[PDB]
Ligand binder design. Structure first.
Ligand code: MG
Ligand code: ZN
Ligand code: ZN
Lengths: 103, 412, 119, 194, 124, 49, 145, 263, 64
């Protein structure tokens, strides 16, 4: 407890509290409400929205720029092998393509 | 469901904008892609724009036809609008699931004509009934007043927000809920596709003319405003002879302030009510309103009639400095001709000694909008952080984390 | 950055310009899908195609202002064809165009003389 | 883009010259805003400006827009038909596809819009197994290269409403910190695992 | 199956023409004061003035040729709602997708009721 | 600025005061948070050396 | 600001002239004015004034004095444009080409606001516009706007 | 019969009137002329030295829009080059793209003003040569210079249609107005106090009726008689455009027939 | 910087029509109306030479 209400100081560099362990826990500006409650995450993205009158309701226009960077693993079914392969042979720079192959 | 267009923004569906309480002011929205094939299932079978068109918050719909497709419906569900055989055809290519059969024409006279209701009632499911019965309505029509559908065909009145918006017994509500999302989900695709297509070639728009009240009928506006000065004159001076009086709630100075903000507020309505009651029914902005699409009676009266008086903390423009509203006025000037209260509209429109009063009333709902932006959020988390605990157990009862039971029903 | 290629507006990416395919439902009626050419050719075979008594329907509509194409449905009903109805139309057009292409090349030089010359 | 009246706008589409309502003069709108961004946001100035800009048509007289002057709508209007147009801004308009006149009359009239900053190609963002902090081992912040996003407390409280045990678990203990450890059965603590 | 349902002459006494461009509801009154009829009809193509006289018909078919040719105005719409009030009598309200109908007379006519749409026929 | 700041933060001064007229300072502050905490000098404003 | 309290300013010379005429009884003539800013006539008491405001349009922000027809909006809209205006785009300095500077945004083709206020000659605004004049047309057309 | 009735002409525009024809065809002609009408324009610059004030990026976009002569165009091999995309040669070759030069320097100390004149084609009387809309001037303005600010540019034009970039259409606008009074009421005029009283009659209004009556209005009537008015840029003579309009509009209808009678 | 060349809405060339424009509103005592003498009947583009700022004379004087 850098400052246990006693007037210690705990100055390490330029007379500034010494980052204690209790500081990280209940910051804020740290865990608790930043590393345990609301965590960033991955496989996501965002951008400006626009209108379109021509999509079904449950439809969402996804720009290729993003589609070319997501996923979305998907195990190899015996139903896919042929279909799924075409994707790889295509490339990760061609929409109908892929990135990474897991073994 | 993604897919997949070009250009770098998220295209999404207008009728879905209400749930995201956010326009296209250059807003951002986040996308989270699932991975495992077991979540892909959750957000498909439970959470779906379709199975989410009716929140239980209110057991009422949360999405509906809004904006241009709505303004369009009115201006097209009118029985003044016939369709040339020439299309029809063209517009039949949305539905999107078309019988293939071309609808039996309503007019076999010299030209073959289709009513605007006809081909509209096409994109509504088959076998949904409605008896809207609005205010004044008679054995007669009497004049496209009300609304009423049968075997998925309308026959009565005119479509507006009253019926294709999140209304109680709303048409949107009524096919949802009979027979579930889809063709339900298609409803928004049909009307929001048919009509947009109609409107494309019908054109619609507004200019100033739509804001400038009749010259003759504007004389009578300025008459009922200056004729409410006399109604203050008989108050500014008659309550200097102690002949008010006051009561209740008090006080005496306040029960004066009252009998004025009352006369000023009501006196305005007269000027605005007359300004509209004198505007051709076919006047843009007035029809945009009748539809429901955007804006209201108080938006028209303020644009073409007057504007003030503006307020602030529940009391017309406050004094200070000294005993005066501003340095272009005497002292003890408890008159509207000064204390927040404009006589003109955003057409002439506003006068200096007025312009400011307006801006400083404006900067109140301009911070009261700065709060609801945060506070509203704070109070939200409170509840959650005390109700996460509860949930409905397989026994038919809602219980605490610890099992401590809070309800014996599912909600009584 | 995600701007579709403009040249991919005037060049069929191995896409069959025209495609003729019946429907079902409707009976004796097919649907044509011209690609990378629309909003001009289409409007004609309509406000003109509907002029042939042989016709009973005249589709025509671009599905999305991003894809540069458009469909066309024709029903008829009952004897032929309707691949023949639209061609009888197209033919009636090219020939109706020259009607004016000639009047133009005829009346041009004709009101070119009144503004002096000479020769 | 936005005018000088707080008509924050964004581009929705880019129609080529033919499609746009070429009418009848016949010019073509450079941009076209929607009529529902008027009556509710009462911003009758945006209108006025356009009726007046126009009037620096067959004049070029730089039309002053001075905050409080005698200059009125009814004034500029007279100045309008003065050049052959409609004393109110309007004009008839021909559709780009068909040639049909539009039933309604369009309020067509110049104005200047401001090219706002923060463009799109600077605001798009996409993550997917990107770098991560060293101390917490979760995803970095905006910029860099180039993740991640952010899944608020607010946000999570909403899965729970629907009821997605698995989505929830996926977007917190997998799609960010996929970490496994081995625990002793008596005193539950990190072991000497291999 | 000749199922004519109307063969009576009417006349116009009032016409609106109430802030609608096309369409206009008119009024009949014929026979023994107790007839009266009222309907919306495109006033762009087939206007009608006072003392327009000339009968109308309805039926539901279909095959005839003369009837088809005769008249200069034809419509088509279901009925949906036919109640009875004030000395038996029947009042029928037929809709033509927007444009509305109203008649007041007892059995004979009555071959109607049936809602199987109608086809209205106007000859001048 | 307007130190402060850390002494509210509900209304006062934010709100526009009749007093401002002139050296206005019209209606030109930031959207939310620091509304009316920042202000701008009118065109005629003259500050006392 | 504290000197105001003891003073009594006027708005427009016209108001002062009307008050001077009344001091001896002079027609008002309110049946000749046409659509305009209906002032508060005539003049409540107040026998003589002390100062009169130069022009009510100098009562404006530096950035808000660039907005056509300010006194005519709903107010709330006025607050905007100014804050957003700063986020405009255009030429900021005739010598940007020489100044090495991080993040700079200029305009290929800037233009004079067409309908502009007589208060920019001073804001040197016509010389380095943020604007660009665009044949705009308010139409409900398609559904993308 | 007829079909066209011209009025005035000039050197940049062609006012006339269509007769026996349908609305569709009208519009479909408006469109044609505004888009798919082959033309030359420059669509690639290589910069060597440029110490002027216009950036390279800014020059490309500007050097582009400056119109060029096209005349015949659709008539190879010479006096007309086919799209550089579907060419019998490789990459870029003078057989399907016209080379242009720009070697502007500075010999003064006052101020330079380089116009469209200073460019140099090749001498293959294509053309070719840009244009000089200005009256006895030298062409549209390109860039200004002070001291030593020579720029050296290699420009080559290709063939393209408006569709591909507004840069190509040799057509300014078009000005049609079928039914100038209000026969077919294809429009509902907004009042505001009195209809035929607020809206101005048009110069082209004095060529018809049907005022008086109360006929009442007709309906068997289709829109015929269209008052167009084509204006060109000055890139290619004032129609030209029109003439070459249908030539590649008929051939656009044909494409169709041939893809349906062969099989 | 310098006239746009080609108006924004139409195609009407305006690169040519300025070296001549400026030599009237300050050299012939004709009005803003004088441009009408340059074939500017449309709005349109004619608000092009009019609403323009000569940002190069005042930029060109930074010589390296
Ligand atoms: Mg808002
Ligand atoms: Zn080549
Ligand atoms: Zn132009």
């Amino acid at each position: 407890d850098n400052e246990i209400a006693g007037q210690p100081q705990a100055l390490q560099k330029s007379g500034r509290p010494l980052k204690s362990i209790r500081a990280r826990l209940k910051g804020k500006e740290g865990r608790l409400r930043g590393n345990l409650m609301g965590k960033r995450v991955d496989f996501s993205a965002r951008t400006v929205i626009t209108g379109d009158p021509n999509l079904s309701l449950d439809e969402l226009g996804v720009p290729r720029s993003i589609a070319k960077t997501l996923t979305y693993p998907e195990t190899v079914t015996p139903y896919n092998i042929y279909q799924l392969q075409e994707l790889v042979r295509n490339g990760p720079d061609e929409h109908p393509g892929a990135k990474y192959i897991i073994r | 469901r993604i897919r997949v267009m070009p250009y770098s923004t998220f295209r999404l569906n207008l009728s879905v904008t209400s749930p995201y309480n956010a326009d296209f002011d250059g807003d951002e929205m986040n996308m989270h892609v699932p991975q495992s094939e077991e979540t892909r299932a959750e957000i498909q079978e439970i959470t779906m724009v379709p199975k989410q068109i009716v929140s239980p918050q209110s057991n009422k719909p949360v999405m509906g036809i809004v904006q241009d497709t709505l303004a369009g419906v009115r201006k097209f569900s009118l029985r003044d609008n016939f369709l040339t055989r020439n299309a029809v055809m063209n517009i039949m290519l949305w539905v999107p699931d078309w019988d293939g059969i071309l609808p039996p024409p309503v007019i076999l006279k010299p030209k073959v004509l289709w009513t605007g209701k006809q081909i509209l009632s096409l994109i509504i499911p088959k076998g949904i009934n409605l008896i809207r019965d609005d205010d004044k309505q008679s054995l007669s029509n009497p004049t496209d007043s009300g609304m009423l559908i049968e075997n998925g065909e309308i026959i009565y009145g005119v479509v507006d927000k009253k019926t294709v918006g999140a209304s109680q017994g709303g048409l949107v509500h009524t096919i949802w809920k009979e027979k579930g999302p889809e063709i339900c989900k298609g409803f928004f695709n049909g009307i929001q596709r048919v009509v947009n297509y109609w409107l494309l070639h019908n054109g619609f728009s507004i200019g100033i003319g739509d804001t400038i009240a009749d010259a003759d009928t504007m004389k009578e506006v300025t008459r009922t405003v200056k004729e409410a000065r006399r109604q203050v004159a008989e108050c500014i001076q008659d309550a200097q002879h102690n002949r008010l009086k006051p009561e209740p709630g008090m006080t005496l100075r306040e029960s004066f302030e009252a009998k004025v903000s009352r006369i000023l507020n009501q006196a305005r309505d007269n000027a605005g009510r007359s300004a509209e009651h004198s505007l051709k029914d076919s006047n843009n902005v007035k029809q945009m309103v009748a539809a429901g699409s955007k804006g209201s009676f108080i938006n028209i009266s303020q644009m073409s009639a007057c504007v003030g008086q503006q307020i602030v903390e529940g009391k017309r423009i406050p004094f200070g400095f000294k005993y005066r509203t501003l340095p272009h006025f005497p002292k003890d000037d408890d008159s509207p001709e000064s204390r927040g209260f404009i006589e003109n509209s955003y057409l002439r429109g506003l006068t200096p000694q007025e312009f400011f009063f307006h801006a400083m009333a404006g900067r109140e709902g301009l911070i009261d909008t700065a709060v609801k932006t945060a506070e509203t959020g704070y109070i939200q988390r409170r509840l959650v952080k005390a109700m996460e605990d509860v949930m409905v157990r397989y026994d038919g009862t809602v219980r605490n984390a610890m099992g401590d039971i809070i309800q014996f029903a599912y909600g009584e | 950055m995600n701007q579709p290629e403009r040249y991919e507006l005037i060049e069929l990416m191995g896409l069959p310009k025209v495609t003729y395919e019946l429907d079902s439902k409707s009976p004796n009626a097919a649907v044509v899908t011209l690609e990378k050419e629309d909003h001009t050719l289409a409007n004609m075979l309509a406000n003109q195609l509907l002029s042939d008594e042989r016709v009973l329907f005249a589709g025509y509509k671009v599905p999305h202002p991003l894809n540069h194409n458009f469909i066309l449905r024709v029903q008829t009903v009952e004897d032929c064809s309707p691949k023949q109805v639209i061609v009888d139309a197209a033919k009636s057009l090219i020939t109706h165009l020259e009607e004016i292409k000639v009047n133009f090349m005829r009346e041009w030089e004709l009101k070119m003389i009144s503004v002096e010359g000479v020769e | 883009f936005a005018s000088r009246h707080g008509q924050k706008g964004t581009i929705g589409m880019t129609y080529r010259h033919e499609d746009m309502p070429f009418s009848a003069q016949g010019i073509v709108p450079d941009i076209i805003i929607n009529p529902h961004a008027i009556p509710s946001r009462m911003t009758v100035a945006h209108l006025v400006e356009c009726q007046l800009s126009k009037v620096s048509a067959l004049s070029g007289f730089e039309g002053d827009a001075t905050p409080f002057t005698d200059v009125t709508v009814e004034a500029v209007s007279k100045l309008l038909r003065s050049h052959g147009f409609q004393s109110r801004g309007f004009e008839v308009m021909y559709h780009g596809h068909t040639g049909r006149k539009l039933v309604a009359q369009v309020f067509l009239g110049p104005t200047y819009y401001q090219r706002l900053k923060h463009l799109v190609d600077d605001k798009i963002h996409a993550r997917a197994r990107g770098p991560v902090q060293i101390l917490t081992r979760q995803p970095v912040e905006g910029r860099s290269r180039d993740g991640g996003l952010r899944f608020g407390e607010m946000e999570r409280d909403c899965q729970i409403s629907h009821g997605c045990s698995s989505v929830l678990r996926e977007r917190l203990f997998d799609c960010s910190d996929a970490y496994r450890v081995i625990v002793c059965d008596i005193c539950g603590l990190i072991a000497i695992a291999s | 199956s000749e199922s004519v349902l109307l063969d009576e002459i009417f006349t116009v006494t009032s016409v609106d023409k109430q802030k609608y461009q096309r369409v206009s509801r008119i009024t009949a009154v014929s026979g023994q004061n107790d007839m009266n009829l009222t309907l919306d009809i495109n006033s762009q193509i087939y206007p009608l003035e006072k003392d327009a006289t000339f009968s109308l018909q309805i039926t539901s078919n279909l095959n005839s040729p003369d009837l088809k040719e005769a008249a200069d105005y034809i419509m088509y719409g279901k009925v949906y709602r036919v109640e009875e009030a004030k000395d038996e009598k029947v009042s029928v309200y037929v809709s033509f997708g927007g444009l509305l109908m109203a008649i007041e007379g007892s059995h004979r006519k009555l071959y109607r009721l049936s809602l199987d749409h109608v086809y209205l026929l106007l000859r001048r | 600025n307007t130190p402060i700041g850390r002494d509210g933060k509900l209304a006062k001064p934010r709100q526009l005061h009749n007093t401002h007229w002139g050296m206005v300072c019209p209606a030109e502050t930031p959207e939310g948070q620091a509304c009316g905490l920042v202000k701008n000098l009118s065109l005629m404003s003259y500050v006392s050396v | 600001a504290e000197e105001e309290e003891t003073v009594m300013i006027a708005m427009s010379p016209e108001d002062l002239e009307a008050s001077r005429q009344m001091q001896a009884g002079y027609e008002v003539k309110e049946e000749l004015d046409p659509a305009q800013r209906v002032k508060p006539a005539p003049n409540p008491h107040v026998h003589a004034w002390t100062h009169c405001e130069i022009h009510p349009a100098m009562i404006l922000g530096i950035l808000a004095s660039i907005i056509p027809f300010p006194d005519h909006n709903q107010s709330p809209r006025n607050t905007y444009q100014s804050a957003m205006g700063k986020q405009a785009m255009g030429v900021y300095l005739t010598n940007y080409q020489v100044r090495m500077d991080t993040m700079a945004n200029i305009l290929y083709y800037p233009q004079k606001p067409l309908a502009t206020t007589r208060s920019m000659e001073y804001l040197k605004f016509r010389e380095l516009p943020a604007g660009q004049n665009a044949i705009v047309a308010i139409l409900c057309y398609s559904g993308y706007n | 019969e007829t079909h066209i009735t011209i009025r005035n002409i000039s050197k940049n525009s062609v006012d006339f009137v269509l007769t026996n024809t349908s609305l569709a065809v009208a519009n479909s002609l408006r469109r044609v002329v505004l888009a798919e009408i082959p033309t030359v324009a420059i669509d690639l610059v290589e910069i060597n030295v440029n110490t002027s004030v216009m950036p390279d990026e800014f020059l490309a976009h500007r050097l582009g829009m400056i119109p060029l002569d096209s005349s015949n165009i659709d008539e190879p091999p010479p006096v007309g080059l086919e799209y550089t995309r579907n060419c019998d040669c490789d990459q870029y070759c003078p057989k399907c793209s016209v080379e242009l030069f720009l070697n502007a320097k500075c010999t003064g100390e006052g101020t330079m003003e380089i116009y469209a004149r200073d460019l140099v084609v090749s001498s293959n009387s294509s053309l070719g040569h840009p244009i000089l809309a200005d009256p006895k001037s030298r062409g549209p303005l390109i860039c200004k210079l002070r001291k030593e600010q020579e720029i050296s540019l290699r420009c080559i034009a290709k063939k393209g249609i408006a569709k591909e970039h507004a840069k190509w259409s040799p057509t300014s606008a078009v000005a049609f107005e079928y039914d100038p009074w209000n026969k077919l009421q294809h429009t509902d005029y907004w009042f505001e106090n009195d209809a035929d009283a607020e809206w101005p009659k048009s110069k082209n209004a004095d060529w018809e009726e049907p005022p008086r009556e109360g006929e009442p209005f007709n309906f068997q009537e289709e829109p015929r008689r269209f008052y167009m008015d084509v204006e060109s840029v000055g890139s290619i003579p004032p129609n030209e455009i029109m003439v070459q309009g249908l030539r590649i509009l008929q051939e656009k209808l044909a494409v169709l027939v041939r893809d349906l009678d062969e099989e | 910087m310098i006239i746009p060349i080609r108006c924004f809405s139409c195609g009407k060339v305006i690169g040519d029509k300025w070296d001549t424009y400026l030599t009237l509103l300050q050299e012939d005592n004709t009005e803003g109306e004088a441009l009408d003498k340059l074939g500017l009947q449309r709005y349109c583009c004619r608000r092009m030479i009019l609403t323009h700022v000569d940002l190069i004379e005042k930029l060109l004087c930074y010589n390296p």
